[PDB]
Structure formats: structure tokens, C-alpha cells
Design a binder for this molecule. Structure first.
Ligand SMILES: OC[C@H]1O[C@@H](O[C@H]2[C@H](O)[C@@H](O)[C@@H](O)O[C@@H]2CO)[C@H](O)[C@@H](O)[C@@H]1O
Length: 302
């Protein structure tokens, strides 16, 4: 399809771009430190997903050239988001996110990524140096309407519950795609040293979702049918911004009064530890001709 927004970090992108919050990323959703403190551009240290590589002729010595660099998104004890200038700090969450924008504007992108059929691409790689704690829930990728709901979510870690249940949950370390109602559509183990490639097709007209997945250099394959996602609101209230990064929920603190334990935005246990995940292959396309499945192939989608 036609690329509507490209979040595949250029090889020439720098910390200075992130700190200026310029295209393609709005960088405001983070703690008070500079964007480049939480999000690192990995250069040639980490090979990004091979799906969007270019290929050389001849095919030795180098078969492939990377067309992007991977991003390392970190959260730590300072990763407390304050809404606006004056909001109550979100002390229950630890979060660092990048939001899709064009011309310095998330607003202008809403109608573009929110009409017709749109494929949301993203690949993730486990960070071995700052391990995620799968005792907690992490919301990694989502499209969020103004009400803060998620049209879909890529999640990993044990889902937050009040009261606390057995932890870790079964398959806590499985990546999960959820619908807007939080139903698990697809789940797969978050194996290390592997690029986990996804596309989620949103049909904004019919309010459906379809999940596509592969590992490493393998082309995306469909792993769900076209599924209804009918809890999404009608019209503009069902559209919203594309986020990727880490949004870590807390655990219940029984020391808190019962009346606030559900308010994970402001209450709950968060250890003062650092955690990361790596991203590549993050972009949004329409479905003209078909879905980009990797390796310079398109596949027609019904
Ligand atoms: O309110 C609890 C839910 O918070 C969700 O995070 C939202 C938040 O509510 C919004 O105000 C805004 O800050 O965006 C956040 C991320 O979309 C969270 O996703 C849910 O899991 C919580 O139940």
C-alpha cells in the first residue's frame, strides 16, 4: 500500500531530532528528561527487522542494506508523565511513548490514518540489557481515541488485576494483540533475539481488525480472520493517535485505600527500575494493491 506515515527511523536520524520532537515522532509522552534520554537510536549496534531491507547485486559480499535503525525505548523511575502543563502526574504508570505525527502535528494525521482500511506495522525485539518485568502489564503499541481507549493494543506481561492474582500469569511473556474490548485475538511467545513482526489492519468503515505476524525475515502471514471490533465508537470518537513505546501499569498496593486501587494512572506499586524494548519496522500504509508483507512483496487483502 501507500505509506501514510513512516516511523522507520532513518539511518541519519539523531538524538537532536528526538529532542526537537520533529517528524516523524511526537515525543511529549515521557518523564521530564529529554526525549533522547528515554529513546536511543541504535545505529549499526542492532540490526533492525530484515523485512524492509534493500538488497544488493551482487548478493555477496553484502546481500542486504538496512534502510532504518532500530529504536531502544526505555522507562525508569523518572518516567512519570504529566498531562498538559498542569495535570496531576501519572504516578501509577511508567511510560515512554512515541506518537505518529506529520508536519509536527498528530491532529493532522488523524483523518489520514483513520479512513478506509489502514495497516499498522510494528516489529519488536527483546532488550537483553534492561529486561521487562513480566509481573507487570505493558501496553506497547496502540491507537488511542480521545477517551483513552485503545482500538487495538500490543500487550506483554501479566494483565493488571485488582485484587492481585497469581503472578506471573500464564503466558505472561507472550506478546498479545487485543481488540478494543481487551479480547485476546492472537498471542505468541516473546522469544529473545527475534524480530517479532506485526501488522494490524483496521477497517475504519466496518470496524474490523485483522492480525498479521511473522518472525525475522519471514513474510507476514495472517494469524486471525477479519474480526469485528464493534465496541469502538462511531465516527470521529473512534479514531485517534498511534502510540508505540512502553506503558507499564503498576501492581495494586494494598496499603492504598480500596477506593483508589483501580486508579492505575495514579496509584500502585512501581519499582524504581529501568526497562527497555526495541522497535523497528514501525509504519502505517493503506491497502492499495495490497499489504506490504516484507521482502518487497505485496499481498492482496479481502
Ligand atoms: O484509566 C485507567 C486506564 O488508563 C489507560 O491509560 C490511558 C489514560 O486513562 C488516559 O487518560 C491517557 O493518559 O492515555 C492512557 C493510555 O492510552 C490504560 O491504557 C488502561 O489500561 C487503564 O485501565
Amino acid at each position: 500500500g501507500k505509506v501514510l506515515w513512516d516511523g522507520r527511523a532513518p539511518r541519519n536520524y539523531t538524538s537532536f531530532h528526538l529532542d526537537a520532537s520533529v517528524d516523524p515522532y511526537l515525543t511529549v509522552v515521557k518523564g521530564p528528561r529529554a526525549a533522547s534520554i528515554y529513546t536511543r537510536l541504535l545505529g549499526r549496534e542492532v540490526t533492525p527487522t530484515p523485512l524492509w531491507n534493500d538488497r544488493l547485486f551482487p548478493e555477496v559480499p553484502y546481500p542486504a542494506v538496512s534502510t532504518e535503525q532500530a529504536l531502544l525505548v526505555l522507562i525508569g523511575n523518572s518516567s512519570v508523565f504529566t498531562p498538559g502543563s498542569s495535570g496531576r502526574p501519572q504516578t501509577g504508570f511508567r511510560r515512554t511513548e512515541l506518537i505518529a505525527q506529520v508536519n509536527g502535528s498528530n491532529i493532522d494525521l488523524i483523518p489520514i490514518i483513520g479512513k478506509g482500511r489502514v495497516a499498522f506495522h510494528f516489529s519488536v525485539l527483546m532488550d537483553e540489557w534492561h529486561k521487562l518485568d513480566m509481573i507487570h502489564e505493558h501496553q506497547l503499541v496502540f491507537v488511542a481515541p480521545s477517551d483513552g481507549s485503545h482500538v487495538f493494543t500490543l500487550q506483554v506481561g501479566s494483565p493488571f488485576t485488582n485484587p492481585t492474582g497469581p503472578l506471573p500469569a500464564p503466558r505472561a511473556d507472550w506478546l498479545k494483540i487485543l481488540n478494543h474490548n481487551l479480547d485476546v485475538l492472537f498471542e505468541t511467545e516473546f522469544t529473545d533475539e527475534t524480530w517479532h513482526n506485526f501488522a494490524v489492519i483496521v477497517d475504519w468503515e466496518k470496524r474490523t481488525l485483522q492480525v498479521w505476524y511473522s518472525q525475522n525475515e519471514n513474510n507476514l502471514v495472517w494469524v486471525t480472520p477479519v474480526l469485528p471490533n464493534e465496541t469502538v465508537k462511531r465516527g470521529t470518537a473512534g479514531r485517534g493517535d498511534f502510540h508505540f513505546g512502553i506503558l507499564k501499569l503498576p501492581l495494586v498496593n494494598v496499603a492504598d485505600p480500596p477506593e483508589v486501587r483501580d486508579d492505575v494512572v495514579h496509584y500502585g506499586i512501581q519499582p524504581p527500575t529501568t526497562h527497555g524494548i526495541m522497535y523497528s519496522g514501525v509504519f502505517i500504509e493503506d491497502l492499495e494493491d495490497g499489504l506490504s508483507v516484507g521482502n518487497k512483496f505485496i499481498q492482496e487483502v479481502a
